[PDB]
Symmetry: D2
Subunit: 386 residues, 4 copies
């Protein structure tokens, strides 16, 4: 009955179930949650762990003694429940000081502060056991063309991430970074807008091995992109360090619906890929229970995230294991896709008349791909209509 | 009066002005153009050169003697006009054999043929003087999730591009490749859907220095992305080997409107960036005169591409040179964006109380960015309303 | 096992299964189908009927004796199979004469021809038993602002539809019209771009009762709209005269995927609505088997259209009949949504202190909507995970 | 120098320049503005008037004596400046009670309260001289399919608007309503998502003459629609009662950029249409100065709204008055578009061999539309490059 347990490695941000419901046009619909209560409630649902921005766990502007007490209470809740903290991150977007960015703010003093704020929280993350440190530069970007020279901003972004890599190396930490792309919102355009742009940027860092991506379902879908395809490219690059799961209906504001909502077939193909690839990181939900809901609806929405993942996991596994699907995959030449094109080498390909002079293009063209039968088997498996 | 000359380095594909007007829903509205006539007409408008797919210059399936004659006539037209051929490319999308791809077709024999077809045309491109060889993998992708394992497809794509790099190296050619991303159309999703994804892929090739990107205005805009920002990231990476200029109205089918049409302000900021950066490659137009037009309208639309570039060039230069704009840029801290965040180094930043313990976040937050005044100066310059 | 029969009222256009695979970038991948063969193949799959544009059944430019023979053969196929022809339409988009429109072409002679071409085919439609005559004005619109004065074009569009209404009235036909909106493609913007715009236009015709809409799943989704919501508004207006079923992934070119593909949850909610409302018109598929497919894949894709409708029909009925769902609907106040707001009348509402002076806004605000639990029951029913 | 004066009829919402900068992800960046100060500042810029939601002028939950004092101060500011109040509206979206809607909330008590809250503010609007009463049902809609039966919701929406019409009739007010469509945000899908849907709905009200639309540039652009085309359809219907001017870059969250920003060419064609049509209502700006800005930037952004309208007005008038453009319009048959198709009547069209039997489709097809030359004249006029 698709019941999650901590072995399933499902995690949630404090800010997810804790979202009070404020939007562009609306005041809060729910009271604030104490992190202790969210840890307890999430553990009861079968979650494995929780994640946090600095300012979700310790109110911004807290004294040292307040900080210590917030962390102490949180640690007790983790210990009481067995919940883990696999990932943490910095809030470089809410406070007005970050209105033009953190790491790529035009004001240099703000860039330096953003780095100090991040470093302080890396130390805390490591204390709480986090393996991954996410960075979503939601304020990096512009509403107008003159406001932001993007080459200069990328220079600043590289400096910042290189400094953070120097810092973790200096401390001997085993934490790695995961850069989270988003195309827009809250800035008119955000820098590193997709998985591809973030992967490309990482290759230019001083120590690329320390950095990967944290793609989010809805973010790539805000650019109309295929989220499973982007995850495949991240896996191909060896850079899927973390993932954010939720739902989105296309090219809109970021909806943050529960996982499985939004594009259901994309959710199916995502689960199929993560499971086929043996992704071993957390299945993290970055979602918002709609502001229509009370707390009972918050916990129902969170439970639904995990339930939908588990249903889709079952159906994708059944699809791949079905001998009729295995035959359809061969009929569609998925086996041939996985074979090298020219392991014989360049000269042999050049000398191979079957590749040009004697290639019957019409006979090859006439061979159907059989993709529709394959896809209807996939549909039948998803819907439990076999 | 914004008159182009060959010194402006404007180029056009044969398939642009030569588009007969067939669309998803429509038969041709114009007769076919002889490439000789297009070279002559484009030169009269002040173009610098033309580009071609193999199958635009030599009909698919031509004999050797037909090939020779098509090339001879084209060479005569180039010589008669002084037109250049800076770029060429392969058609790996029209023939039905490529219905599932060229380099990433599931059928291995098709992948090998695609490579042979490409190599044949690289030789021709070099003979005609081309410096850049574009690859738009418009058939690489899928309409359904099971049809294409993207990790396997990227393995095949890397093999193909690595073989092409081995080939040009073996021949001692000074041609470089430019990979053209597109998010969708004609496939439901295309592999390497954006500039970022293509840049990331190139970093995993055996000889990355041989490959860059050929971004197209409308392609990035089909994902709702900021084209100037993506061009900035390509320039930051040293990978803007070629560019395709046209117009697009957002998230639709690829419209291929003349340059300056579609998103006019994005066209302004693009020109500003190319000119500020000293981009020295061709300003290539990959556009389609609308099928409403006769040949007179074809040539008017082509002329408009160049005219709009030159108007925007004038206005962007005036913007950057205006001392009132220079003052506004300082007021908005664009100068500070260009300064290193922490050239003092990590330890100095950690020990700098002005960066954390004594940083007045409220005073920094209160300082307006002055971006709206800057942007209205930009608007006034674009519109000739100063 | 979700087997369709003619009682299910599934219909297909000749141009659907008959699509040869030509796209923006690609030549045909399949040979042409004789309409007789498509009628036979569709009947074997359990279809109820077929639909046609004039020029799909009789090649454009046919002589009277060729026309007669094409119709005779088609009629024999219908008689051999028991297939019906519930709908027909005019091709006012393929021939180059329609490059600026049919009914709203700037050239008046083209507008008059479009009307004559339509009237000729209305007569044929009635002979073949069609109840509905669709009009998709795919060429009505513009790529540029000066090319088309939309008020003038709407005047021309109204004249055309009013003339067609006068014609059917004059002949005593019992056929009604169904206007098909689309937002763009092949024109940069199409007139009457959504269900709403078409509904609004109809209200200004001389005999609105003769006209309704023919909404298409993918067309509304090309504007990012909620297709079930638009269908609900059409049903509310009494104007759902016909419907086109297919799949689409968001804001792209019109994909015409098989029904159930694309946005699966939207397909579920659509079926739920059509069945709840007792829609009694044809379930018509306007789709294209992908050009990757051979004929076996064409028929598999067509079969999948019907299969997916029947699966979704079963799941939506089970959802609505489940007493746990019925309780959840009451918990979410769907019953209260269906009750008049103020059947007591305006003055009673004005005098009702419970509506203002004594309304406890905080108590009402605190009551959760319970929509997430309801939606997860819907998900569980769709996936067969109850 | 494009200086606005009150004769230009530019108006602004209190909530525009008064936006404190809170977004999905961000706290306020500016202090609250007293409405008195905004009236004074806007008048100094040359505005004609201001508009308000109830809760922008009188804080929600105010006592009668607080209400009276807020209104008194506002009235004094209007009198001090000569500013008008042409439009008012109700906030049926911020307070948590409206989390599922106002007029279409599932809770009936909320629907009744929404009506009472609206009626109270209609009285105030009339006292302050407003001619138009806007209704933006931003909370009417859903995030999930089961939560909202749209036919039932439209029944509730019609009841509400019919009651409001009964109310204004009963009081003898000369105020009219303007319904503001939006496709999404804050709800996943909003009811009446476009101009077309709102126009269609109005036709089903009890007294349609009392209601029109208040279209917003960015709202229609959030569906990828052509805003000038939608305005043309509203004008064709006689229903453009008010308009909201701003800027938007395509399919995103609602950006609310200053007018002229976003899609500049669409802004040009909009101004051309409003001025050609002789629209005599307010030119109202519903925009948000970006949260990067301080108050000086707020007023610069507001000034830019008006400046851009005036520049575009000049250029559109010059375009239409240019005899070379007038000749190009005739060459493109815009004159013929404006002539009736068949004033000779149906029978004459049926008997006209020039319309079918003797229509030379190839000769008509061959005649180019000359739209690209026309559009480049339009570009040249916009850019001041003639
Ligand atoms: Co998100
Ligand atoms: Co996230
Ligand atoms: Co293109
Ligand atoms: Co291109
Ligand atoms: Co379609
Ligand atoms: Co259709
Ligand atoms: Co807005
Ligand atoms: Co508005």
């Amino acid at each position: 009955n698709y019941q999650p347990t901590p072995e399933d490695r499902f995690t949630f941000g404090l800010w997810t179930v804790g979202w009070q419901g404020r939007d562009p046009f609306g005041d809060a619909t729910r009271r604030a949650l104490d992190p202790v209560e969210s840890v307890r409630r999430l553990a009861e649902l079968g979650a494995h762990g929780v994640t946090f921005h600095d300012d979700d766990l310790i109110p911004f502007g807290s004294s040292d003694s307040e900080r210590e007490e917030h962390v102490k209470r949180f640690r007790q809740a983790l210990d009481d429940t067995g919940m883990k903290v696999p990932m943490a991150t910095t809030n470089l977007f809410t406070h007005p000081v970050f209105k033009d960015g953190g790491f790529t703010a035009n004001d240099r003093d703000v860039r330096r502060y953003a780095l100090r704020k991040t470093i302080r929280n890396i130390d805390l993350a490591v204390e709480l056991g986090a393996e991954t440190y996410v960075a979503w530069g939601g304020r990096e970007g512009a509403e107008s063309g003159g406001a932001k020279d993007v080459r200069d901003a990328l220079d600043r972004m590289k400096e910042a991430f290189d400094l953070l890599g120097e810092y973790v190396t200096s401390q001997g930490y085993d934490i790695r970074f995961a850069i989270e792309p988003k195309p827009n919102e809250p800035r008119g355009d955000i820098l590193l807008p997709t998985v591809g742009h973030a992967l490309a940027f990482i290759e230019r860092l001083e120590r690329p091995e320390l950095y990967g991506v944290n793609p989010e379902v809805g973010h790539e879908q805000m650019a109309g992109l295929n989220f499973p395809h982007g995850i495949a490219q991240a896996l191909w690059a060896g850079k899927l360090f973390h993932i954010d799961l939720n739902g989105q209906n296309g090219i809109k504001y970021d909806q943050d619906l529960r996982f499985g909502a939004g594009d259901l077939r994309a959710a199916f193909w995502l689960v199929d890929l993560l499971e086929s690839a043996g992704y071993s990181g957390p299945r993290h939900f970055d979602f918002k229970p709609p502001r229509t809901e009370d707390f009972d609806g918050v916990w129902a929405s969170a439970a639904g995230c995990m339930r939908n993942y588990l249903i889709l996991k079952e159906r994708a596994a059944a699809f791949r294991a079905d001998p009729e699907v295995q035959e359809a995959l061969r009929a569609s030449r998925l086996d041939e896709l996985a074979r090298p094109t020219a392991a014989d080498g360049l000269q042999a390909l050049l000398d191979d008349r079957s590749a040009f002079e004697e290639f019957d293009v019409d006979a090859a063209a006439a061979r159907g791909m059989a993709f529709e039968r394959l896809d209807q088997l996939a549909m039948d498996h998803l819907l439990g209509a076999r």
